[PDB]
Amino acid sequence: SIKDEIYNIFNADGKILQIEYGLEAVNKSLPLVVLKNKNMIVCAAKKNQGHLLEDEVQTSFQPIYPNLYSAFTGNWADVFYVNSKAKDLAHYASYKLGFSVTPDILCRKLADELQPLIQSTGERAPAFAGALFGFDNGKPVVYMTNISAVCYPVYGSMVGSKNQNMYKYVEKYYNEDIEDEKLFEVAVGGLLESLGENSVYQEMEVAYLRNGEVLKYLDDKEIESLLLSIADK
Amino acid sequence: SIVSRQNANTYSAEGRLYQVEYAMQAMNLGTSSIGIKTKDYVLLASEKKIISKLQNPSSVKKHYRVYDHIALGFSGISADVKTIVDKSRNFAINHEYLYDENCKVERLLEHLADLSLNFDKKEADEKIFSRPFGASLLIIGYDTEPRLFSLDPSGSYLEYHAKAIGSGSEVIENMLEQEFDPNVDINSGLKNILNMLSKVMKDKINNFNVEITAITKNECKILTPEEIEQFLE
Amino acid sequence: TTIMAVKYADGILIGADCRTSMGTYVSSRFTDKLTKISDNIYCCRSGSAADTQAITQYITELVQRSSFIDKEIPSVKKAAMAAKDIIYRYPNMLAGLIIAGYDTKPRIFNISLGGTMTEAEWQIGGSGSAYIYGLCDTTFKPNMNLEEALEFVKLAVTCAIKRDNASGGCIRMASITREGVQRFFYSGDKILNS
């Protein structure tokens, strides 16, 4: 029993128990949503603990490289570790490629670097989940990856606590040709399906990305209006 | 491997390393031997471990010549002692190479003690084994004075006027505290040491189951059976 | 080559010629010598063509790397230092760079062949620079406007082109300011016809 629990090996059921446990650790983390339409990428997530002595702005969306961002959830230390590893890989791959690396290449590289932690014993697999996203030659692209070392091209990712409810909402309402404001509403509603529709705006952050500019965060009043619109209909 | 190295280096709640405690049990599971120091001479007598009489007495030697004026007797696991002897010879020859002189016996003891507990070190010449050596050594030599040294598997060593190792160590010590006097001649000293040895030998003491090394200012003599015959009576 | 860098009232202005040559033959006459390190840092390469390209390719990723680790605009100082180590650690690489940019204030850094890094208010380099040291010394004025500095670079590089055989073609110029980078172009038609 303990042989399969501890080591990164297949149990009699055909699953690696350690990866499942890391996935549980991720699932217990804060909720986060990244969702994209034909023209923009929208990401919303629950803000971290509101310490009164805080002297920082703590965002779950981290720029990794020019026109390349990440939105990860899980253990704060593991999320930071994978962000720094992604920056390392991005700069190395940009050196090798002759051009700034794009989100797809970086997701593939990061997952291929995470896989050895899944196939071998000695190093703990980081407990993280989220999407590396950005704009690739004018097209918004979102790639989802997590502790299990998978990498898929996705319209969006819903990670963290109660990610299944967020998925159920988003898939029901989401579409690619959805409008920008409707994309905002769908993403924030998917998040609220985890947080609860009665949550106040101070509890979560929203940012959006457009082709020619940096990632931008919605203002407090903007989030108030967005939540009022979502609750209205 | 890390697990095996940790098993080597684990400390006991009482203090001493577990491996050292086990090596100290192994160190006296062998035939007995006595070392006597006098301001003129140092003796070292050991009963041979003749498992069968078909095993010729000549080839079961128990004293190894470490250098021009250093001899090494041992008790316990005899396999480790040839490695210890080889590294001691290397140390002595290196010391002569650097300084053109015969090393002090204390310097060889210091070198061996340093090498003893270096299980972890990755270079062979900077350690003896990956574990304590399962042998207790009586190292004698002449360095402007007859010197008798005992090296334990714990890496500790002490200069002695007289010591006994092997299964008869305790009995021979309880006899030494009564019988030993350093104001005695070398021939009478040989008689006394052989008398003490015969007390513990499984069979009757003779010149073919006994090996004697006597190091003096003049020679590092190893006594022939025709010479041990003089002292057996 | 004739690479030039002048710091003026509100940013950096770098000028360069277009000619690249091997011997008496001009292998290309449209070479871009103003190498972009980042959106706000530009490098004027001089020395071995292959080695200076190798450095600027590495400095490009190093300055971006640290920029996102630090979470701030890329630092022209860090790019210049990163260039100095490579130029110093590898004597076999014949490279000398003018690295000029705008992170918080305009800065010009000159890395000589052996890795000697100095901060300058104006800097020139390349084979053709030898012929405009007196012209640049007498004509330089602190805190020029864009038009005054553009004339200064235009005059200096033009006089280097008219004298240095390894220097020729139109004068590429690029003004890095806090507002961004604006490229200029002084066609050789005007320079040669005069």
Add this chain to the structure above:
Amino acid sequence: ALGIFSPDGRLIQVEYAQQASEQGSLVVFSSDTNEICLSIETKTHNKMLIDQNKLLPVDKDLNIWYTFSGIKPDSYKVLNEARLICRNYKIKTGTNISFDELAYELSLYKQKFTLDSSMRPFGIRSILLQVKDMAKIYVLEPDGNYSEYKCGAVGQKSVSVCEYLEKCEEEDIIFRSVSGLGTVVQSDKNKVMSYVISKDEIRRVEDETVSQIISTVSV
């Protein structure tokens, strides 16, 4: 545990290797000043199995021969290292390796696999044998111990054979070796071979005589 002491001060894996070296086909030998007689017994349950020669030469000009008891595949590696030691010593030094040096270096090779983790003791009692100037037989333990033997036996139930040899002080070493082997083996179940190693020459003894002498023991 591997390459480490047990709570009672025992190298457990080394003694397990000793035991594994005891669970092997019995080999018996006896020597005089100018010759050695070496006898080996083998299981004949398989008629289709062709019995391998267990007396292999280490170096033909030095007239050194090798025999073993225990895990057969380990014997291949140990014999290969014996031959390599002889050849490398002649390359490096320019002179033939002495028998004692070969025994010492082979014993060091044996010990090597008991000083380290991640590796398993050979677990074979290996016999070095030479007749150039005088008969000399070395028996190397799996743990690296080695010492000369005038006569002895190794392998399955060899302790009883050594006990018998202690008493069987007969002048003819052929008699001694074959009779000592006969104390254990069964003529119906065990096919037996006997060799006499002489000055730079080798030959095996007649089956009739060996069988006749073996029949008189353990009747």
Add this chain to the structure above:
Amino acid sequence: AILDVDTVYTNTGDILQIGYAQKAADNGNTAICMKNKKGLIMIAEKPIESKLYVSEKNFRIKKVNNSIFQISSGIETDLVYINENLKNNLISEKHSNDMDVSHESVRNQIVNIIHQFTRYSGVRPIGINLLTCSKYKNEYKILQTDCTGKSLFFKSSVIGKGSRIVKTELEKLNLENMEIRDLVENGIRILYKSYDPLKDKPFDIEIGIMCEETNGEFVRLEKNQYSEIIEKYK
């Protein structure tokens, strides 16, 4: 069976060994760091285990470089490794760029060096809470690092056993337009407010300030500067 044999996940996703490390860290001596526009200070309890120790010459605050210094609670010897590696990395980084290491770079180094202990098998979690105070571009920031490697910037922070009582007092505290000596006064007062004599031994105070009056250089105050305050709050 609990899977705490190594730094591995339990069936609920928790890494038990990191929890044990946090238990060890939360039982260390308290250190308080308070940051302000005018400067930065850190207070450190130094319990008198025996009067034989020369407390005035044993320092809890370890400098990473001229502009970064840090203090730890828990198994404070782990700070030896953490500080040595941080110093080796950041001195080289500073002098290879001829400019100060930024707060974010220090945070990156802290997190990446602390995480590998929570990430490998034959390794033991760092088992300390760590406060790292630094100056960069004429700004001061305090970085409180947990055993997980999670490190956040704070306006004022405390580690050690008495953190629970000190944190509320800090939350009651306004730092804007406080003089550095006001910070010293408040820090000593809050430290003594969490003494709990019946459970903790008497302690000496180690105070290190980093303010304009010393052009941002780390200065370890001598006892005569705050003996009056210690007498006031003993």
Add this chain to the structure above:
Amino acid sequence: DYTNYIIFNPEGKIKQLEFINNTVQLGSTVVALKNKSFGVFVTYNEKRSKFALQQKKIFPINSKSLFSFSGITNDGTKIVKYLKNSTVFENIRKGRDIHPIHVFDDLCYSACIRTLTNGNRLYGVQGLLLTDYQGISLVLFDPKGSAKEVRGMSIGSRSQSCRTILEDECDKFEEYNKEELVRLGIKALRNAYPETGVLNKDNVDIWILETNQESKQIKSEEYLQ
């Protein structure tokens, strides 16, 4: 489960780091007293047998520097060699004497490495370094990787009685003279060893260090007999 190797037990402590505290208590007593001008080492040495020679627990690192330790003697000898090498390097390559505390920086880093990872062996030696550096300074080195300055300390078997005897008089060390410090060290040993005859002219070796002066071994006749 948690006893065998380096990991936190559920209560949050590493058992091996506690076991090394028992390990460092094996050796014979060393009693150290420091005054700004001079310092004293007092040791108790017992022959392991009637025929064993004394082990000379105190080692001089350099003129005006003494080191002594309790516990595994191999680690103590390693530390003695380390301190000698550091003295040579600091005198030559840095033009100064070893700093009593900072000379232990590399050793503390190595010890911390050992306490953080398995496979590597924890140091089982506790050392006292008495050296003249801007005055006499006494340093206690612990196997956990920390070196701390002390007014006086006792290491080895039964050292707690010596420690409490010293601690009852620590505030007066700066006023005591050399004879007074030697007397207090012998008193601490006596409190640890109240059995008469055990402490004698042969079993106790006293080492004196005075600022701006060489370190010397002085006869114990005047203080025990």
Add this chain to the structure above:
Amino acid sequence: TTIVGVKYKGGVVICADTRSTSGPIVADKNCSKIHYISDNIQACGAGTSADITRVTRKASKVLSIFSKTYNRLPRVSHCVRTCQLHLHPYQGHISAALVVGGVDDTGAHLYDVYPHGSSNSVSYTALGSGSLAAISILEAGYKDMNREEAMELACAAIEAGIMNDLYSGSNIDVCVISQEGREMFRNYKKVGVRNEVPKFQYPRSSVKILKEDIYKYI
């Protein structure tokens, strides 16, 4: 040789002469100097013939693994960077100069790569022994062009090198990479026409066989 490269509005034209030489002796006729790198990238090189093939083969591997892995047609900048990172460490001992051209999602790109690892984005290029003869035609005739005019300017450029350079001759290979894909014209022209020499036959009796051994394939 006269390998030439011309960039026009929506693609590139890479032309080359079909000749190889070792000293004053022509070694290979109809030699194909345009090497495959990708469906949208072709490279033509001058220098050590073995180094051109192997350097362009390394780029072909790295770009094939990239496109297969990421399902994304490679960029010309990726090909040039791979070549630069390979040529530079050898300090030019691997003597390979390339004219890499292709069409990516960013448009048409044409590069000059030199043995020491330097690269240069260009509008038109000539390389090899006939570069000077070719570059003279490109200088005079180059402008903003379509593929038809780019085809003839490049072919006229090669023709000049074939006619005026001793070590250039035989045919003209042409390869156009446009946004619609690459299309090849092997032996696009036969400017180096040879004479119609008759055959010459020895009598079979003119050679004597000393001994003969016959072996059969199985």
Add this chain to the structure above:
Amino acid sequence: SSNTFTEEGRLLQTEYAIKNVSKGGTIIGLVCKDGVILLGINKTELLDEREKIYKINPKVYVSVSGLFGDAMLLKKYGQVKAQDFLYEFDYDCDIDRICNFISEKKQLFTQYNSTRPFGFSFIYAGMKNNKFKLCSTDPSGTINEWKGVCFGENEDAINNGLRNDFPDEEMDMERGLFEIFKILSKVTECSAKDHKKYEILYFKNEESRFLEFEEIENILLRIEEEKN
């Protein structure tokens, strides 16, 4: 477990590896007057490619039983080592050299603690001193020479039949294969019932060839008729 001894003085991992072999497809070998028969029984119709019998060099062939992955790994290793021998001394090695290569690697893998034994056995057909030979190698690495041997399913039954049912008479490999089929059918009917899973090699040192199932059925009719 791993590669370590036990109180019984045996490598349990090697014993389990040897046990694994008996679950593999049956392979048989027999030395005859004019050659060596190598026979293998596949689990499926496999005319696409030979799978039970392979070639090492112009004068060594091997049969396979046990773990297929390890078997192919060491088959490739043995082929590479035979080619290295040819590179060294400019002539092809005999059966003994291939046996030595594979046995050395197998022993290395049963002696290294952090690895597992190879779970397969080989039968080597070859020549030495101008006389045909038939060796074998177990997972332990032991080399056994045989007049005849069997491994895989029904290994013990076929081995017993060879022990006491195979005539001691020297015979050419035609009658050798006839007798092999006789004893195989006596042990189990499935051998004489079906033939499309068979791989049979008529090893001659210079002109070895494989038998078509038409030839196998020609043997089958002879065995069917001889008893009538």
Add this chain to the structure above:
Amino acid sequence: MFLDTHKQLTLFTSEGKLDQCDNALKAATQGSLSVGCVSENGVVLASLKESNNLVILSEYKKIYQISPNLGITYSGCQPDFRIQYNLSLKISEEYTDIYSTNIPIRLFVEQFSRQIQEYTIKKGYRPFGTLLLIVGDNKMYRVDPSGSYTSLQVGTIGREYTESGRLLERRKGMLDDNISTCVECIREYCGRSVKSEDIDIGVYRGQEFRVYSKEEVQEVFDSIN
């Protein structure tokens, strides 16, 4: 004890079986179904794609190309397949470097299977948890975690493999119709109505292997309906 990185995670049980290899085979067997059908004119290869997690089915691919003549698809965990795909691309590119031709199916499968098997003997490593179908040169090979390969006429990997394999035997035919025949065969083993987005198809015709575009898969389904 903490994780032993030097441990051999694959060993024979007392029953002669490899414990971890069977678990890896079980893990592979749970993957999404994928099939291949050999024909007298070529070989078809089809697999199903899960539409969950908002995966862009148009961009997500299940059938991959190794060389112009080889294709591959898997059942099992994706990361292991991605690593094995990197390995296979390395193999094919190395062969093309040496010989300049497209790697033959059998040589590729052999060189690939040996490196797959490497992990059943590598210390501290578990075998890949993926089954692989390799289509090329008018042949099909199924490669399992053990590193054992078998050429096949009709093969299935993933869920419902045995019964689907039996159904494929009932659903063979000419390559042009075999595509629709096998699409019908695998329509019996999908949890929801299959759109063209949900299936990848790769067909080896003549001398090359090509993966159908999403538009082509619509054409195949238009024939189905």
